[PDB]
Design a protein around this ligand. Structure first.
Ligand SMILES: N#CCC1C=CC(=Nc2nc(Nc3cc(C4CC4)[nH]n3)c3ccccc3n2)C=C1
Length: 307
Protein backbone atom coordinates (compact mmCIF):
# COMPACT_ATOMS: atom_id res chain seq x y z
CA UNK A 1 0.00 0.00 0.00
CA UNK A 2 2.97 2.35 0.74
CA UNK A 3 5.54 3.12 -1.96
CA UNK A 4 7.15 5.73 0.34
CA UNK A 5 10.14 4.75 2.38
CA UNK A 6 12.31 6.24 5.08
CA UNK A 7 16.04 5.77 4.59
CA UNK A 8 18.80 4.79 6.99
CA UNK A 9 22.36 4.66 5.52
CA UNK A 10 20.84 4.83 2.03
CA UNK A 11 18.73 1.68 2.65
CA UNK A 12 14.93 1.80 2.52
CA UNK A 13 13.04 1.27 5.77
CA UNK A 14 9.34 1.15 6.61
CA UNK A 15 7.82 1.41 10.09
CA UNK A 16 5.37 -1.38 10.98
CA UNK A 17 4.16 -0.67 14.50
CA UNK A 18 5.16 0.86 17.74
CA UNK A 19 5.74 -0.30 21.37
CA UNK A 20 6.35 1.98 24.38
CA UNK A 21 9.46 2.05 26.48
CA UNK A 22 11.23 4.19 29.13
CA UNK A 23 11.98 7.93 29.32
CA UNK A 24 9.02 8.56 26.94
CA UNK A 25 10.91 6.77 24.13
CA UNK A 26 9.43 4.23 21.78
CA UNK A 27 10.51 1.26 19.78
CA UNK A 28 9.13 0.38 16.42
CA UNK A 29 9.13 -2.93 14.66
CA UNK A 30 10.39 -1.90 11.23
CA UNK A 31 11.44 -3.50 7.93
CA UNK A 32 14.95 -2.52 6.81
CA UNK A 33 15.49 -3.86 3.28
CA UNK A 34 14.09 -7.44 3.71
CA UNK A 35 14.53 -7.95 7.41
CA UNK A 36 12.74 -6.86 10.54
CA UNK A 37 14.59 -4.60 12.89
CA UNK A 38 13.81 -2.57 16.01
CA UNK A 39 14.08 1.20 15.66
CA UNK A 40 14.35 2.91 19.04
CA UNK A 41 13.37 6.57 18.87
CA UNK A 42 14.39 8.88 21.73
CA UNK A 43 13.15 12.40 22.30
CA UNK A 44 15.93 14.99 22.39
CA UNK A 45 15.28 15.18 26.15
CA UNK A 46 16.64 11.63 26.51
CA UNK A 47 19.74 12.31 24.38
CA UNK A 48 21.92 11.27 27.32
CA UNK A 49 20.47 7.72 27.22
CA UNK A 50 20.72 7.55 23.45
CA UNK A 51 24.35 8.69 23.55
CA UNK A 52 25.18 6.34 26.38
CA UNK A 53 23.77 3.27 24.62
CA UNK A 54 25.54 4.23 21.36
CA UNK A 55 28.85 4.64 23.27
CA UNK A 56 28.43 1.32 24.97
CA UNK A 57 27.71 -0.45 21.71
CA UNK A 58 30.74 1.29 20.30
CA UNK A 59 33.06 -0.30 22.82
CA UNK A 60 35.44 -3.07 21.75
CA UNK A 61 33.94 -6.55 21.64
CA UNK A 62 30.25 -5.59 21.89
CA UNK A 63 29.00 -8.26 19.55
CA UNK A 64 27.83 -11.46 21.23
CA UNK A 65 25.12 -14.05 20.89
CA UNK A 66 23.71 -12.97 24.27
CA UNK A 67 23.86 -9.21 23.70
CA UNK A 68 21.07 -7.64 21.64
CA UNK A 69 22.67 -6.92 18.27
CA UNK A 70 23.38 -3.30 17.43
CA UNK A 71 22.72 -2.20 13.86
CA UNK A 72 23.32 1.55 14.00
CA UNK A 73 22.49 4.97 15.47
CA UNK A 74 21.99 8.45 14.15
CA UNK A 75 20.56 11.92 14.73
CA UNK A 76 17.77 12.61 12.27
CA UNK A 77 15.90 15.71 11.17
CA UNK A 78 16.67 19.40 11.30
CA UNK A 79 18.70 21.49 13.73
CA UNK A 80 15.39 22.38 15.45
CA UNK A 81 13.30 19.20 15.09
CA UNK A 82 15.72 16.42 16.11
CA UNK A 83 14.95 12.72 16.56
CA UNK A 84 17.56 10.24 17.83
CA UNK A 85 17.47 6.69 16.37
CA UNK A 86 19.12 3.54 17.56
CA UNK A 87 18.44 0.40 15.61
CA UNK A 88 18.92 -3.14 16.85
CA UNK A 89 17.79 -6.62 15.85
CA UNK A 90 14.12 -7.45 16.26
CA UNK A 91 13.03 -10.55 18.21
CA UNK A 92 9.41 -11.60 17.57
CA UNK A 93 9.13 -13.44 20.93
CA UNK A 94 9.86 -10.18 22.69
CA UNK A 95 11.03 -9.66 26.27
CA UNK A 96 11.23 -12.37 28.86
CA UNK A 97 8.62 -10.40 30.82
CA UNK A 98 6.02 -10.50 28.06
CA UNK A 99 6.93 -14.14 27.41
CA UNK A 100 6.38 -15.23 31.00
CA UNK A 101 3.12 -13.26 31.12
CA UNK A 102 1.77 -15.41 28.28
CA UNK A 103 3.61 -18.75 28.84
CA UNK A 104 4.86 -21.20 31.42
CA UNK A 105 8.37 -22.68 30.97
CA UNK A 106 9.53 -26.28 31.29
CA UNK A 107 12.56 -26.98 33.40
CA UNK A 108 14.74 -27.32 30.28
CA UNK A 109 13.34 -24.10 28.79
CA UNK A 110 14.11 -22.36 32.08
CA UNK A 111 17.73 -23.59 32.14
CA UNK A 112 18.36 -22.47 28.56
CA UNK A 113 16.97 -18.97 29.27
CA UNK A 114 18.89 -18.71 32.56
CA UNK A 115 22.17 -19.96 31.14
CA UNK A 116 22.15 -17.76 28.05
CA UNK A 117 21.11 -14.76 30.12
CA UNK A 118 23.94 -15.38 32.66
CA UNK A 119 26.42 -15.77 29.83
CA UNK A 120 25.46 -12.41 28.34
CA UNK A 121 25.69 -10.63 31.67
CA UNK A 122 29.00 -12.42 32.54
CA UNK A 123 30.39 -11.26 29.17
CA UNK A 124 29.11 -7.67 29.73
CA UNK A 125 30.83 -7.62 33.13
CA UNK A 126 34.10 -9.03 31.74
CA UNK A 127 37.22 -6.96 31.05
CA UNK A 128 38.89 -8.44 27.92
CA UNK A 129 42.27 -7.22 26.55
CA UNK A 130 43.47 -8.13 23.11
CA UNK A 131 40.48 -7.72 20.76
CA UNK A 132 41.04 -6.55 17.19
CA UNK A 133 38.81 -3.53 17.90
CA UNK A 134 40.54 -2.76 21.29
CA UNK A 135 40.31 -3.53 25.00
CA UNK A 136 36.74 -4.33 26.19
CA UNK A 137 36.09 -2.82 29.63
CA UNK A 138 33.91 -4.38 32.29
CA UNK A 139 30.43 -2.89 31.88
CA UNK A 140 27.63 -2.71 34.49
CA UNK A 141 24.13 -2.70 33.00
CA UNK A 142 22.29 -0.89 35.85
CA UNK A 143 18.76 -1.83 34.82
CA UNK A 144 18.66 -5.63 34.74
CA UNK A 145 15.08 -6.93 34.61
CA UNK A 146 13.00 -9.36 32.58
CA UNK A 147 11.81 -6.59 30.31
CA UNK A 148 15.50 -5.98 29.30
CA UNK A 149 16.05 -9.61 28.38
CA UNK A 150 14.92 -10.41 24.88
CA UNK A 151 14.27 -13.90 23.58
CA UNK A 152 15.25 -15.34 20.26
CA UNK A 153 13.05 -17.90 18.53
CA UNK A 154 14.75 -20.83 20.37
CA UNK A 155 14.45 -18.99 23.71
CA UNK A 156 18.14 -18.00 23.69
CA UNK A 157 18.37 -14.83 25.84
CA UNK A 158 20.07 -11.55 25.03
CA UNK A 159 20.62 -8.57 27.26
CA UNK A 160 19.15 -5.34 25.96
CA UNK A 161 19.03 -1.57 26.73
CA UNK A 162 22.39 -0.02 27.53
CA UNK A 163 21.04 3.47 28.11
CA UNK A 164 22.19 3.40 31.76
CA UNK A 165 25.18 1.14 31.36
CA UNK A 166 28.52 2.21 32.83
CA UNK A 167 32.00 1.04 31.79
CA UNK A 168 34.94 0.75 34.13
CA UNK A 169 38.55 1.38 33.17
CA UNK A 170 41.20 -0.21 35.45
CA UNK A 171 42.81 3.26 35.35
CA UNK A 172 40.01 5.33 36.94
CA UNK A 173 37.11 5.53 39.46
CA UNK A 174 33.49 4.95 38.36
CA UNK A 175 32.26 7.58 35.84
CA UNK A 176 29.21 9.86 35.66
CA UNK A 177 25.76 8.17 35.92
CA UNK A 178 24.20 11.64 35.34
CA UNK A 179 21.58 11.11 38.07
CA UNK A 180 19.91 8.23 36.16
CA UNK A 181 18.92 5.11 38.14
CA UNK A 182 17.18 1.78 37.38
CA UNK A 183 13.74 0.23 37.86
CA UNK A 184 12.76 0.66 41.56
CA UNK A 185 11.39 -2.88 41.88
CA UNK A 186 14.78 -4.40 41.03
CA UNK A 187 17.00 -2.08 43.04
CA UNK A 188 19.31 -3.66 45.55
CA UNK A 189 18.88 -2.58 49.23
CA UNK A 190 22.08 -0.49 49.18
CA UNK A 191 20.68 1.45 46.17
CA UNK A 192 17.33 1.88 47.92
CA UNK A 193 19.20 3.16 51.03
CA UNK A 194 20.95 5.74 48.84
CA UNK A 195 24.52 4.51 49.41
CA UNK A 196 26.69 6.47 46.94
CA UNK A 197 30.18 6.44 45.40
CA UNK A 198 29.81 2.79 44.36
CA UNK A 199 32.81 1.29 42.51
CA UNK A 200 33.13 -1.50 39.91
CA UNK A 201 32.44 -4.53 42.05
CA UNK A 202 29.52 -2.78 43.80
CA UNK A 203 27.81 -1.93 40.48
CA UNK A 204 28.25 -5.55 39.37
CA UNK A 205 26.69 -6.81 42.63
CA UNK A 206 23.77 -4.50 42.00
CA UNK A 207 23.18 -6.14 38.63
CA UNK A 208 23.43 -9.66 40.24
CA UNK A 209 20.71 -8.80 42.83
CA UNK A 210 18.36 -7.72 40.04
CA UNK A 211 19.38 -10.89 38.19
CA UNK A 212 18.32 -12.96 41.24
CA UNK A 213 14.90 -11.40 40.87
CA UNK A 214 14.74 -12.36 37.18
CA UNK A 215 15.73 -15.91 38.01
CA UNK A 216 12.82 -15.86 40.57
CA UNK A 217 10.49 -14.82 37.76
CA UNK A 218 11.54 -17.83 35.73
CA UNK A 219 11.16 -20.14 38.77
CA UNK A 220 7.70 -18.73 39.42
CA UNK A 221 6.43 -19.87 36.02
CA UNK A 222 8.26 -23.18 35.73
CA UNK A 223 6.29 -26.46 35.49
CA UNK A 224 9.00 -28.28 37.45
CA UNK A 225 7.22 -27.00 40.59
CA UNK A 226 5.51 -29.92 42.32
CA UNK A 227 2.26 -27.97 42.38
CA UNK A 228 0.31 -25.30 40.53
CA UNK A 229 1.94 -22.56 38.48
CA UNK A 230 0.31 -19.21 39.28
CA UNK A 231 -0.33 -16.39 36.87
CA UNK A 232 2.66 -14.21 36.16
CA UNK A 233 3.53 -11.49 38.61
CA UNK A 234 6.41 -9.06 38.74
CA UNK A 235 8.88 -9.38 41.62
CA UNK A 236 7.37 -7.77 44.74
CA UNK A 237 4.05 -7.16 42.95
CA UNK A 238 2.18 -9.38 45.44
CA UNK A 239 3.52 -7.19 48.22
CA UNK A 240 3.62 -3.61 46.79
CA UNK A 241 1.78 -3.91 43.43
CA UNK A 242 2.41 -2.65 39.90
CA UNK A 243 3.30 1.00 40.64
CA UNK A 244 5.40 1.32 43.84
CA UNK A 245 7.02 4.45 45.25
CA UNK A 246 10.68 4.41 46.28
CA UNK A 247 9.32 4.52 49.87
CA UNK A 248 7.27 1.34 49.23
CA UNK A 249 10.35 -0.49 48.03
CA UNK A 250 12.54 0.82 50.83
CA UNK A 251 10.05 -0.46 53.36
CA UNK A 252 9.71 -3.92 51.86
CA UNK A 253 13.38 -4.57 50.93
CA UNK A 254 15.56 -2.44 53.24
CA UNK A 255 13.42 -2.31 56.37
CA UNK A 256 11.57 -5.64 56.25
CA UNK A 257 14.46 -7.45 54.43
CA UNK A 258 11.80 -9.36 52.42
CA UNK A 259 12.14 -11.07 48.98
CA UNK A 260 9.77 -12.75 46.52
CA UNK A 261 8.60 -16.08 47.96
CA UNK A 262 10.53 -19.27 47.17
CA UNK A 263 7.95 -21.97 47.82
CA UNK A 264 9.04 -25.24 49.49
CA UNK A 265 7.09 -27.23 46.81
CA UNK A 266 9.39 -25.65 44.18
CA UNK A 267 12.23 -27.65 45.81
CA UNK A 268 11.15 -31.28 45.24
CA UNK A 269 12.78 -31.15 41.81
CA UNK A 270 16.52 -31.30 42.63
CA UNK A 271 17.29 -28.79 39.89
CA UNK A 272 14.79 -26.24 41.17
CA UNK A 273 16.07 -26.64 44.70
CA UNK A 274 19.48 -25.69 43.47
CA UNK A 275 17.93 -22.82 41.46
CA UNK A 276 16.29 -21.54 44.62
CA UNK A 277 19.58 -21.66 46.50
CA UNK A 278 21.27 -19.73 43.68
CA UNK A 279 18.48 -17.11 43.75
CA UNK A 280 18.91 -16.65 47.50
CA UNK A 281 22.66 -16.11 47.03
CA UNK A 282 22.11 -13.57 44.22
CA UNK A 283 19.67 -11.40 46.23
CA UNK A 284 21.43 -11.53 49.59
CA UNK A 285 21.17 -8.27 51.57
CA UNK A 286 25.02 -8.40 51.78
CA UNK A 287 26.32 -7.36 48.33
CA UNK A 288 29.74 -8.96 49.03
CA UNK A 289 27.99 -12.31 49.58
CA UNK A 290 26.34 -12.28 46.12
CA UNK A 291 27.44 -14.57 43.29
CA UNK A 292 29.12 -13.19 40.18
CA UNK A 293 27.46 -13.66 36.76
CA UNK A 294 30.12 -16.23 35.79
CA UNK A 295 29.51 -18.19 38.97
CA UNK A 296 25.77 -18.06 38.32
CA UNK A 297 26.36 -19.48 34.81
CA UNK A 298 28.28 -22.41 36.28
CA UNK A 299 25.53 -23.06 38.82
CA UNK A 300 23.03 -23.15 35.95
CA UNK A 301 25.20 -25.68 34.05
CA UNK A 302 25.26 -27.84 37.21
CA UNK A 303 21.49 -27.76 37.77
CA UNK A 304 21.15 -28.97 34.15
CA UNK A 305 23.80 -31.72 34.58
CA UNK A 306 21.94 -33.07 37.64
CA UNK A 307 18.23 -32.30 36.91
N1 LIG B 1 15.28 -1.70 25.08
C1 LIG B 1 14.52 -2.35 25.62
C2 LIG B 1 13.54 -3.11 26.39
C3 LIG B 1 12.26 -3.40 25.60
C4 LIG B 1 11.46 -2.35 25.12
C5 LIG B 1 10.29 -2.65 24.41
C6 LIG B 1 9.93 -3.99 24.16
N2 LIG B 1 8.79 -4.24 23.48
C7 LIG B 1 8.67 -5.24 22.58
N3 LIG B 1 9.75 -5.68 21.89
C8 LIG B 1 9.66 -6.66 20.96
N4 LIG B 1 10.79 -7.05 20.33
C9 LIG B 1 11.97 -6.35 20.31
C10 LIG B 1 12.32 -5.20 20.93
C11 LIG B 1 13.60 -5.01 20.58
C12 LIG B 1 14.56 -3.86 20.96
C13 LIG B 1 14.81 -3.67 22.46
C14 LIG B 1 13.96 -2.65 21.69
N5 LIG B 1 14.00 -6.03 19.77
N6 LIG B 1 13.03 -6.79 19.62
C15 LIG B 1 8.38 -7.24 20.71
C16 LIG B 1 8.17 -8.28 19.80
C17 LIG B 1 6.90 -8.82 19.58
C18 LIG B 1 5.80 -8.33 20.31
C19 LIG B 1 5.99 -7.30 21.24
C20 LIG B 1 7.27 -6.76 21.45
N7 LIG B 1 7.44 -5.77 22.36
C21 LIG B 1 10.73 -5.03 24.64
C22 LIG B 1 11.89 -4.73 25.36
Amino acid sequence: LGTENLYFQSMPLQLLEVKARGRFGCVWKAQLLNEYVAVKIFPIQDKQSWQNEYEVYSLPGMKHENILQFIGAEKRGTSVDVDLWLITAFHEKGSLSDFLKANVVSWNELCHIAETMARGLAYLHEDIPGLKDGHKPAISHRDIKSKNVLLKNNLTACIADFGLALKFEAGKSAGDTHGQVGTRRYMAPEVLEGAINFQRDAFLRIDMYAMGLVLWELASRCTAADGPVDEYMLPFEEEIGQHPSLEDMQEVVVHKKKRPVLRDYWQKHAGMAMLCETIEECWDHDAEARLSAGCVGERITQMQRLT
